[PDB]
Amino acid sequence: KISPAEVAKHNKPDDCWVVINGYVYDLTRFLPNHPGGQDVIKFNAGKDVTAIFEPLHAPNVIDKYIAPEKKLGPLQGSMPPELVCPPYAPGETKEDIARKEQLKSLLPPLDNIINLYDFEYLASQTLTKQAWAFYSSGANDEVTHRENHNAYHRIFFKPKILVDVRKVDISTDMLGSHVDVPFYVSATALCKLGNPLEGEKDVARGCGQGVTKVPQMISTLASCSPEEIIEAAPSDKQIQWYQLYVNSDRKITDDLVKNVEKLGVKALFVTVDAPSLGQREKDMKLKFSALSKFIDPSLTWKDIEELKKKTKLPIVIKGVQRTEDVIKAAEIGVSGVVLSNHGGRQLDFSRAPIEVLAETMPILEQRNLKDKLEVFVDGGVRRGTDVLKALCLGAKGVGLGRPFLYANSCYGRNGVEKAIEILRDEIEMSMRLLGVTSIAELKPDLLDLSTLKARTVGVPNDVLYNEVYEGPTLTEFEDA
Amino acid sequence: TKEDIARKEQLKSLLPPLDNIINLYDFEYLASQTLTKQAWAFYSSGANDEVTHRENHNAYHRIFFKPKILVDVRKVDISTDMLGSHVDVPFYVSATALCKLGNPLEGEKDVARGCGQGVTKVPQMISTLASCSPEEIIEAAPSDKQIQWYQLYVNSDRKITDDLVKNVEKLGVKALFVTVDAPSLGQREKDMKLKQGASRALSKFIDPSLTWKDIEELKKKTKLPIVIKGVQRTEDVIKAAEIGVSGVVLSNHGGRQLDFSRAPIEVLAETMPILEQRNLKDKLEVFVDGGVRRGTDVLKALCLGAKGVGLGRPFLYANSCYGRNGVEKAIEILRDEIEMSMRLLGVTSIAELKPDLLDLSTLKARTVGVPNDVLYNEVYEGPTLTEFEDA
Amino acid sequence: KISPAEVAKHNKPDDCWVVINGYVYDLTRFLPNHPGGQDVIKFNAGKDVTAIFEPLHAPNVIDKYIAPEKKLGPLQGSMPPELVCPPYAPGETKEDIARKEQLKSLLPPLDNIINLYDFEYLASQTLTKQAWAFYSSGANDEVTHRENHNAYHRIFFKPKILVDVRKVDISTDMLGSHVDVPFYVSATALCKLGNPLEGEKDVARGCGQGVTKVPQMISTLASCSPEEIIEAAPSDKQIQWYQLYVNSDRKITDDLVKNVEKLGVKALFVTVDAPSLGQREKDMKLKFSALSKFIDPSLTWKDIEELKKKTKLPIVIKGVQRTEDVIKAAEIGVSGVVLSNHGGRQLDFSRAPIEVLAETMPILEQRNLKDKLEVFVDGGVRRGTDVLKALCLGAKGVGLGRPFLYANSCYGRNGVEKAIEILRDEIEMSMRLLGVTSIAELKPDLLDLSTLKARTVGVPNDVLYNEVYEGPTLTEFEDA
Amino acid sequence: TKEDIARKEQLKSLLPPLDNIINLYDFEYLASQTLTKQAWAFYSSGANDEVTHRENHNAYHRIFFKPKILVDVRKVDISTDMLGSHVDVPFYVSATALCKLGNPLEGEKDVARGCGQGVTKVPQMISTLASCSPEEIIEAAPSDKQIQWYQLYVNSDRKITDDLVKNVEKLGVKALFVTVDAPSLGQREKDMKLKQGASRALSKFIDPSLTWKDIEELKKKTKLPIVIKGVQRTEDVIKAAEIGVSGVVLSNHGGRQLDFSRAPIEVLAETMPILEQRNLKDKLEVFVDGGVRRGTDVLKALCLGAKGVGLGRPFLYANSCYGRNGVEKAIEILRDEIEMSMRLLGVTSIAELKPDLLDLSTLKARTVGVPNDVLYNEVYEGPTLTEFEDA
Ligand code: HEM
Ligand code: HEM
Ligand SMILES: Cc1cc2nc3c(=O)[nH]c(=O)nc-3n(C[C@@H](O)[C@H](O)[C@@H](O)COP(=O)(O)O)c2cc1C
Ligand SMILES: Cc1cc2nc3c(=O)[nH]c(=O)nc-3n(C[C@@H](O)[C@H](O)[C@@H](O)COP(=O)(O)O)c2cc1C
Ligand SMILES: Cc1cc2nc3c(=O)[nH]c(=O)nc-3n(C[C@@H](O)[C@H](O)[C@@H](O)COP(=O)(O)O)c2cc1C
Ligand SMILES: Cc1cc2nc3c(=O)[nH]c(=O)nc-3n(C[C@@H](O)[C@H](O)[C@@H](O)COP(=O)(O)O)c2cc1C
Ligand SMILES: O=C(O)C(=O)Cc1ccccc1
Ligand SMILES: O=C(O)C(=O)Cc1ccccc1
Ligand SMILES: O=C(O)C(=O)Cc1ccccc1
Ligand SMILES: O=C(O)C(=O)Cc1ccccc1
């Protein structure tokens, strides 16, 4: 027993007591190391914070990261009614229902989705403002995020013709496993914000339920536990990869890694591009209407060598942003590198991964390192021809984060299957048209790289000249 | 969708007189306002995102002219010789599937009549999937002098093709264009949106198995000159040369087959030097199409080497609002822009269109800009013009 | 006497009789050679066309270009009331007065004009649709016309600092005359459309009335005669230059040239860039709601040599569009060349004259021709820094056509003086700031030419990606 | 213009709490909604057309980063040494004439208090045309530790200047910035529009006669370190080096003096190699300003060689809506973007910002595009997204 007004006593920034599902916790040393930032816990401190908590955390977390002697005994009965926190939906009004009228069956039938951009549109409408902000933002005014997609558009194709492209096969192998498709679902934190009942379990299900099965990378900061997500996988032939942030308390990482090896995950993607979390202003603005110990900021190349000794899964460094570190990764002998800038949510004038890919692969060949490092690419990928562009430049496989978060959010596991289908078909269709019948035949010679560097900022222009100019017009109908 | 009231009132006597149609885009604006959705999506589409479809046109805007002045230009001559025959103008009507969608009554018979009713006889390429029989169409042609060509998909039941070839040859068509850029229907989502896995796009009519050997054999089975339609890289121009065909139409289907496919004019610019260095240029006729909507686009195309240039959609939507007379006028319009521009470049014969009339120095300034800085812009206010007195 | 219904008899395309100020004319052989195109005369043929005629033609024209035996005797009395043509204002409704309410004193006081773009704005509002169309159009969808101005914007500056720029002097000399300013008014056909009472006489007056006097180039197709325009010039120190189209009947040119030498004009600009008139669709569209003998299309370099023999004024070829013809002009030994594309009203993908200027001047130096040809530039020039850019590249002097047509149209002679003032001041002001004190010191080394060639056409982009993307927003006021 | 009701209601208690100001543009959006027209035109202007004014900022967008990963970055340090003194952060407040237009009550005294009230002490450059006396301002400074500099126009009555120098030196200012890019007030038509021939722009305060010799003499007449403010080409950097001054602020006044003046970052990128090749780099401090509105712009500037970067307008409009506290927060905001970015580039000291952290390969892709093809575009319709069911 712990008398509830004695609990509430400690409603302070520093020496914060809070109630989650009956038990009481001291969230004082904890507060500043919280993943999203201490803010949320501060504002709602000294209350029963259970509605904020439950629909949003991997069940395992308190037991896994809070000190045991901070897990304080139970709250006597309950909390005085305005102290049980209503669910977190900042900025949302009674809106929750117009977005649900929108959702309720007004969502077009899944057969009518023609592409990955339809899920986005549908998801910007029916998703909650916290979830839209969180899923869609980029760091800091967002030029690396949009850049990630536009850079694909600086590459055209050189199609071969009168080649018999009757059967086309797009399977490939990634990290020593034969995979059905050359792309994967990249780790995404908090999928229960968009798909509250199932979250990551439904992406596990859509990736392995159909005839095309796709690799799933699970996030260290996922709303579900890995053991739930791997259980929910419907096919023994589907693949799962685990993404790791290494903690300032290295034993916590140590136990996380031995636990996901045993659970069956096939590779470790260590995310190195986020020492400090990136400023995402669309979320910040909503919370009005960077270091912490969870992601240790002192991780160094010596830590990945010691991490190899502790594990038998191939290690992939996720977040490399220049050729110098792709070579460094090849020298410490790790299994592959994901050239990624974290969806343009971290350092904001970072380059487009396809542009770094282009720069790198000629160097790995000059240095005869090309066959000893698998290079993946993500960010910005939205059409099967964007996947073909990265694969012709020699990316081993391509990842997507947001397209799967919005298919899963709007249509759960069948949205994720429908997106896998949409893109498998775009790749295959665009491979006939490009004259090739297998991933192995996708080579740089099918691309025009000549204006890969046309990244222009135009001179500001001329509001008066253009305000007065008047363009030619079309023929007017006699009436209209 | 009940719009048929609006549309039948839009064409019927609200369409401006043919004499008020200044340019090939006017036809497109009026066709876009009157055709049935199903027709507009089929005619105006592109392969998903349509960036090669817009790029096709816009690469013309990367090429600037280098006009000669004080050159006598009272008399200019735009006739040329494409594929043995000698045609009136340097451009043609390209094959547009199912013309009866816009022109229910006469379909592609009306394009035939427009290509030969007036003064100028413009070549017509007949689609294997025409919604009128080759017979109907050839037979509709107004002149012994208008020349007609056949584009052919080769069918998987090859004897269908062998019948079809030998019968069109009977009907006196003057050449064969084997379209080869479509082993699979590109996703034209505009249609889809209104309307087998990645195989709905595969078809029985068009055979996915086609290969240079099939063209080699098709040479040896016909007398007509054969032109591969759909080449998209220099290597295939040089192969169409080594297997001995007549022409190559540098094309990508109107940006409705692969979507980051280069602009044909950008590929011409590069292939033609190679044909000169490999001495095989005089062998091959190289046609170009996609995006030509103005006389000056036609001329950049001829200055670079193209023997003749084709046009799909302008003719298709001229036909759809004004039938053969519309087709006839679009021919006049483009003939006058080509005449007027030559006289403004200081040239008089199509043979005089060479490259040195062209500023090609920014042909590769195909650029994607870096993302607009939304907030700098949201707070920035520009200058303002003067204001009239209110009173 | 010629009985008026006998007149009207011949109301036909071909065998067109028409009445202008009482006398009758046979405008049959004439019709197809008319400058604007036979259309206007056809439509209104066989009537009393005097209101179309009088407010729009140089008084001298009938007597000067019509065959004398085509000048038929007088119309008996008059024309049946609907056959006296109301004034040409195609597309104009009763509109003539809202544009005059606009004009009537609602036109801002001339002291409030800050720049050349204000006259344009004011002129697009109060000008008549025929005159707006005619003044503002370019040939054929208009990329060379807008290009002419934007190309200036591909050149930046390299200012010198801590230079004593107390007194700055901007006079220069052009075609052997010392001129107050480095720019001139370029020939413009029909100025009475915009300034009906005075037309070109008011530009003659504004160029020479003030303390800064500017060269006036008079047009062979001007609403006023040269003898009226030279009489109206208020200063004996102002300069006038004559622009010539040579006719298919070379004696007509022959007499035009000897007449303007005697009238006092100081140079002959022969316009060679218009064998055929350019398609200007904004006018064509209004006339619904190319060769002719007036401008001989067979003019050849041999005709400019024979024209030199006949004249003592310096000859300037106006309309050169490549370096090869600038050298040809230097070889036939003519006095200068105006690199111009006729305001982007003739061949429409022609280059920007500043860009050809840049290309040419290094060649005239390699070929030691630079001091023996004066090169002028026009088209697109709107700010004094655009004039400085052409002068640092070595243009001898810069011309403007539309800025003077819209100052004269809105404010007559004082608009033309105010524009001369506006630009004299922009040049002078921007010459202090650029560290130089005379035109002779304007040299290429003050410019950055490194992105002179950045003429880009971007890849079409991505309507779906951008339709769904949502940008970061600014802080909302508590209310607004 | 009676708006004063609207504006006094706009600031008074509709301005968001300082704690809700995410970035330096927020200040600009709120100042643009509340200042008097006369103030907004004076603060936010540019020399006619304002293309260098927008270009100043946008050239930052031509430079991309090359981050290092797996570099220990728990502890990063952004203090640097500008002009003998050792400052907290690598950036300063630049001289903004007449701060009392936005901040009537305290003018530039409030910027002094904002630059030293909080934790970080940011340098302040005082305008010779400040609307508060040097005395007032210096005296308002909260710390022995905040450093203050004086920018000086030299007056035509040079003894006024000689008095002014010797008295500011008395008041302990730590250096002199002689602004030299303004022998004549650029035409800021925004002001003009609301408000001698090409000589209204000439003034008595600023002397048009200034010349390197005057700087040479001014060296020999003061002890403070002198920085020429307004250099715009490498040659003048190298001359400021040969006449022995402390720094050069690569500047063009905020794009309100010559209007096609290059972007300072574009000129830094070019001058710094030259200073290395001519061995005189360690001699000169090179500051940069114009357009910096984000921490990453500051860092591109430091990676290229700049010793410190200044900012006019952000501080001026932070001061105008929130006075010294606004000035204090804009300092915090930029300090956190600079810290956060270094930790994301894998660097820890300002000395570690070198150039190899920069993708400078498209620094000269300052491009003007060719004219938008109005009609192709007017008739072109793009794809469309899916639609919710209506019911
Ligand atoms: C008992 C200690 C806590 C731990 C160990 C913890 C841990 C985490 C972790 C690891 C994440 C992201 C992934 C996941 O959910 O597993 C997260 C996110 C978050 N936590 Fe906690 N949390 C704790 C307490 C709380 C409390 C008491 C609240 C309520 C104020 C809360 C609210 C949130 C929210 C709302 C986010 C999402 C951030 C965003 O809005 O973008 N957490 N937490
Ligand atoms: C008597 C024989 C005629 C001659 C020699 C002649 C000559 C010219 C010339 C040289 C110009 C341009 C410069 C100038 O006005 O001097 C012009 C323009 C024009 N003329 Fe005539 N003209 C003749 C008869 C007519 C008649 C009968 C009409 C009435 C239908 C007419 C209507 C016009 C119009 C409206 C234009 C301006 C074109 C435009 O709208 O852009 N002209 N004419
Ligand atoms: C909501 C969201 C959360 C993400 N969370 C993680 C994460 O938990 N761990 C990680 O290593 N990367 C994360 N990513 C980024 C990567 O998986 C990946 O680089 C990706 O999202 C690339 O961007 P795309 O969305 O443009 O494909 C996240 C991205 C988004 C959009
Ligand atoms: C409605 C439509 C149908 C087409 N059908 C065919 C066809 O039957 N066979 C073929 O070879 N090309 C077909 N094309 C494309 C070519 O004739 C040609 O590439 C042409 O459309 C060029 O593009 P443009 O219309 O932009 O000039 C078709 C094009 C359109 C727009
Ligand atoms: C209404 C108008 C009429 C023109 N008439 C002539 C003309 O009579 N003769 C000539 O040689 N050039 C003529 N010009 C063009 C040239 O004087 C000149 O190249 C010029 O107008 C350049 O364009 P700007 O208006 O951009 O300065 C005309 C241009 C306009 C806009
Ligand atoms: C309102 C305003 C007034 C200015 N007054 C001066 C001044 O008194 N003296 C000076 O050297 N610079 C002056 N500047 C410009 C510089 O301090 C500096 O170049 C700065 O404005 C840089 O541009 P930014 O504000 O875009 O960073 C002023 C700038 C502004 C915007
Ligand atoms: O990985 C990311 O992109 C995240 O956003 C990290 C995170 C996870 C959960 C809450 C806030 C931030
Ligand atoms: O060749 C084309 O581009 C066509 O669109 C062919 C076609 C015709 C009719 C239905 C489907 C495809
Ligand atoms: O010189 C031009 O630009 C003209 O427009 C020629 C002209 C003159 C008078 C009427 C029509 C065309
Ligand atoms: O230096 C500047 O940029 C200024 O604007 C100086 C100034 C101050 C007050 C009135 C006019 C000019």
Side-chain angles (χ1 to χ4, degrees), chain C residues 220-256:
Chain C
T220 277
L221 249 44
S223 329
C224 293
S225 38
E227 11 274 306
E228 300 175 79
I229 304 175
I230 279 165
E231 274 181 66
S235 163
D236 306 22
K237 275 175 285 301
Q238 62 186 114
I239 285 166
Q240 284 160 143
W241 294 332
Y242 189 84
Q243 181 261 131
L244 184 70
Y245 279 126
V246 24
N247 195 134
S248 294
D249 174 349
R250 303 296 245 260
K251 202 221 193 299
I252 286 203
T253 293
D254 220 271
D255 302 340
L256 224 206

Side-chain angles (χ1 to χ4, degrees), chain B residues 42 97-98 129 153 253 256:
Chain B
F42 182 63
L98 337 182
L129 279 37
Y153 284 107
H253 240 99
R256 41 171 52 206

Side-chain angles (χ1 to χ4, degrees), chain D residues 35-315:
Chain D
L35 314 210
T36 41
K37 299 179 183 159
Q38 135 82 111
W40 190 233
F42 182 63
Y43 289 157
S44 71
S45 281
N48 38 32
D49 290 323
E50 327 197 322
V51 337
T52 294
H53 181 66
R54 299 166 288 176
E55 167 63 9
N56 269 352
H57 174 68
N58 299 147
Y60 271 123
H61 287 8
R62 238 94 89 199
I63 298 170
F64 271 77
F65 280 133
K66 251 118 115 302
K68 303 176 182 167
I69 39 82
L70 289 174
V71 158
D72 182 340
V73 290
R74 176 216 304 141
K75 184 223 284 173
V76 67
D77 174 49
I78 72 174
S79 72
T80 197
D81 281 282
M82 294 139 71
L83 239 35
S85 176
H86 168 285
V87 299
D88 274 3
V89 289
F91 70 76
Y92 49 91
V93 184
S94 200
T96 223
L98 337 182
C99 308
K100 271 182 185 182
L101 274 139
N103 199 312
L105 256 283
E106 309 306 312
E108 25 286 277
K109 291 193 320 292
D110 251 1
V111 182
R113 298 186 296 223
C115 311
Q117 71 189 226
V119 176
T120 289
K121 287 76 212 65
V122 168
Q124 175 156 203
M125 212 176 73
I126 314 207
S127 178
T128 291
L129 279 37
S131 62
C132 278
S133 61
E135 339 301 299
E136 283 169 66
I137 305 170
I138 290 166
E139 178 283 330
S143 342
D144 186 287
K145 279 169 74 172
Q146 59 181 288
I147 130 170
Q148 287 167 128
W149 303 312
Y150 198 68
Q151 70 82 199
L152 182 78
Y153 284 107
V154 326
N155 203 127
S156 33
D157 193 7
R158 292 263 200 290
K159 82 154 182 69
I160 301 185
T161 277
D162 287 300
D163 284 0
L164 192 68
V165 169
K166 249 101 180 65
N167 160 240
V168 291
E169 189 164 30
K170 166 94 94 172
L171 298 140
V173 294
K174 247 139 307 188
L176 287 189
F177 282 87
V178 194
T179 298
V180 294
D181 67 351
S184 358
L185 152 313
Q187 185 178 346
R188 297 149 55 235
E189 310 178 354
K190 272 186 188 154
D191 307 51
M192 316 203 105
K193 279 217 67 248
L194 131 132
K195 164 186 296 173
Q196 55 187 178
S199 27
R200 155 85 72 115
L202 281 186
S203 192
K204 248 292 181 179
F205 279 77
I206 308 173
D207 170 53
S209 308
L210 261 187
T211 277
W212 289 110
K213 274 201 169 90
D214 288 85
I215 290 297
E216 289 198 314
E217 308 308 337
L218 205 135
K219 278 191 77 215
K220 304 152 192 172
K221 203 167 203 67
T222 210
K223 151 282 143 65
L224 292 176
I226 300 142
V227 188
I228 278 162
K229 171 172 149 173
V231 168
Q232 304 177 75
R233 57 190 177 127
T234 300
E235 293 80 20
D236 294 357
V237 159
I238 283 181
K239 285 163 198 185
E242 294 172 356
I243 67 151
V245 288
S246 311
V248 115
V249 176
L250 240 44
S251 187
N252 68 203
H253 240 99
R256 41 171 52 206
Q257 277 301 300
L258 221 200
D259 199 24
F260 269 80
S261 190
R262 276 137 99 210
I265 199 69
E266 189 204 298
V267 160
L268 230 207
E270 166 188 291
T271 36
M272 299 304 322
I274 298 300
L275 290 206
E276 297 181 49
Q277 288 91 240
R278 284 189 61 152
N279 317 265
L280 67 88
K281 169 174 182 173
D282 60 285
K283 290 56 202 186
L284 201 46
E285 281 203 355
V286 181
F287 296 79
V288 118
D289 56 331
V292 178
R293 308 276 107 131
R294 209 105 206 188
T296 25
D297 302 311
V298 184
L299 299 195
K300 305 193 171 162
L302 302 179
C303 296
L304 272 186
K307 195 86 197 162
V309 329
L311 279 86
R313 268 160 285 214
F315 290 128

Side-chain angles (χ1 to χ4, degrees), chain C residues 93-144:
Chain C
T93 61
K94 290 190 175 174
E95 256 172 7
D96 315 284
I97 289 308
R99 285 182 143 128
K100 290 215 79 70
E101 58 82 3
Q102 205 88 274
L103 282 148
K104 64 90 193 71
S105 296
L106 253 51
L107 259 178
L110 204 59
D111 290 75
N112 298 0
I113 292 312
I114 294 178
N115 58 226
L116 249 41
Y117 296 115
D118 296 315
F119 293 116
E120 273 209 49
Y121 170 62
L122 271 9
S124 57
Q125 315 286 50
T126 80
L127 283 188
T128 221
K129 284 171 164 78
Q130 176 49 16
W132 187 235
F134 182 78
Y135 288 162
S136 79
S137 44
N140 246 4
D141 82 357
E142 299 194 338
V143 329
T144 288

Side-chain angles (χ1 to χ4, degrees), chain D residues 292-360:
Chain D
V292 178
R293 308 276 107 131
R294 209 105 206 188
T296 25
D297 302 311
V298 184
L299 299 195
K300 305 193 171 162
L302 302 179
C303 296
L304 272 186
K307 195 86 197 162
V309 329
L311 279 86
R313 268 160 285 214
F315 290 128
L316 226 195
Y317 317 106
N319 191 31
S320 292
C321 324
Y322 299 99
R324 33 67 143 169
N325 294 309
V327 176
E328 178 202 1
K329 182 156 196 160
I331 289 168
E332 302 187 3
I333 289 191
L334 202 51
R335 193 228 321 152
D336 293 347
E337 297 191 9
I338 293 177
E339 279 180 76
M340 300 187 314
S341 292
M342 293 186 70
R343 176 135 50 195
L344 265 52
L345 282 94
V347 285
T348 38
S349 59
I350 295 303
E352 273 173 57
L353 292 172
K354 281 196 194 174
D356 52 276
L357 253 40
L358 290 197
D359 176 21
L360 294 175

Side-chain angles (χ1 to χ4, degrees), chain A residues 281 285, chain B residues 373-380, chain C residues 471-477, chain D residues 16 20-30 32-33 294:
Chain A
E281 299 176 8
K285 180 170 274 50
Chain B
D373 184 337
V374 168
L375 306 170
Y376 186 93
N377 297 338
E378 277 278 69
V379 285
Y380 170 81
Chain C
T473 48
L474 305 156
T475 350
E476 301 71 15
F477 273 89
Chain D
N20 288 170
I21 297 291
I22 287 171
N23 63 259
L24 253 45
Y25 313 104
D26 291 330
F27 287 132
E28 200 178 326
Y29 168 62
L30 276 344
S32 74
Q33 298 322 287
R294 209 105 206 188

